[PDB]
Write a protein that binds this ligand. Structure first.
Ligand code: FMN
Ligand code: FMN
Lengths: 189, 188
């Protein structure tokens, strides 16, 4: 099929689950967050924010809270699959972009959210920065007991809830991207 | 900092005035291939990529969509589309409709957005103008012709309209939204 650098970036983008501790430069983090805000959104409502998190302590706390919520359910199956895969929710990533969203914008805010997270992932991949979408960061808020705390520490706008996150760093170990399923494309001529 | 992918992301805009010539199969296939390379929660891929080239199907969906707005007690949105030229699809000769599995609610909507943006960036990098079009869903809103359009489009059973991206070459161009740098913050 036809190829160009953007299409190569789309093709090569993969979910990294093993990061080195090396922090990406501010130069690169800025390019990535500038790319995110260029994401389109329904009615241009931009019912999101781009929070570039580099604080290790806050990251570890949200991770440990996330794991504990999972480890607290009656059905521990999910927490057990995670402990067998390495026991990390952020795979040693030294930073992440958290995308909170306005929940009173319902479904349209989630679509917009995904549009922006993909823009981040593609921008990071073009810059040689490994990444992964991580919905599990959301577990830090799930009990509701530490939700306001993490919200203020992250600087969420009032009323905003977690939407998604993208972890960023340099890959320690690689993975191929998912195989494209060509059977999901049809044509209505 | 700048590279081709970052320039595509910055220059992509929502075209609202398309030429009538059909992009080559070769370009359509490249956009469609990019789409299926979108990541999704748990690799669930609760979506499909349907490349719609049938003019009569688009014209009917467009008509049905407009009629829906026209029938609302609040004539506001109907009037907007009319001030924009009265074309719900701005003369696009083709579009990619993305149906989703609604029983996977929010996460499928997030995956829908990921995929539509993959389409928009792939299209833009190829010279193909595009626009996300949630109003394609207006063809289904009364529910009276949702089954019919779903069948005509080839939706998998149980699937519902997620989003769509209109494709074509631009008859006229318009600048993208001005990025609001204030939405970026850092937590050192
Ligand atoms: C919105 C979203 C959330 C995701 N959440 C997680 C997550 O919490 N943890 C994880 O390991 N992978 C997560 N994934 C990564 C997917 O598993 C991955 O994208 C999918 O398996 C396809 O593989 P690929 O990205 O390497 O092509 C998420 C992906 C998306 C799009
Ligand atoms: C998910 C989504 C759905 C959209 N739906 C429509 C639509 O139905 N009709 C339309 O004219 N524009 C639609 N828009 C276009 C937005 O107005 C546009 O993205 C926004 O104004 C930002 O402008 P830009 O794309 O030119 O930067 C949609 C955008 C997104 C992201």
């Amino acid at each position: 099929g036809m190829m160009n650098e953007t299409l190569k970036v789309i093709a090569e983008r993969y979910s990294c689950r093993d990061f080195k501790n090396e922090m990406p430069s501010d130069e690169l983090l800025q390019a990535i967050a500038e790319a995110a805000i260029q994401a389109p959104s329904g009615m241009n409502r931009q019912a999101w924010r781009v929070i570039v998190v580099k604080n290790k302590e806050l990251m570890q706390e949200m991770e440990a809270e996330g794991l504990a919520y999972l480890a607290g359910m009656e059905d521990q199956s999910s927490y057990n699959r995670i402990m067998e895969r390495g026991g990390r929710l952020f795979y040693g990533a030294p930073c992440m972009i958290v995308v909170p969203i306005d929940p009173t914008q319902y479904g349209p805010a989630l679509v917009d959210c995904g549009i922006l997270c993909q823009t981040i992932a593609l921008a990071a991949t073009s810059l040689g920065i490994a990444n992964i979408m991580c919905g599990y960061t959301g577990l830090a808020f799930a009990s509701g007991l530490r939700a306001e705390e993490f919200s203020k520490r992250l600087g969420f706008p009032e009323g905003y809830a977690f939407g998604c996150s993208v972890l960023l760093g340099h890959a320690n170990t690689t993975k191929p991207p998912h195989v494209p399923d060509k059977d999901k494309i049809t044509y209505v001529e």
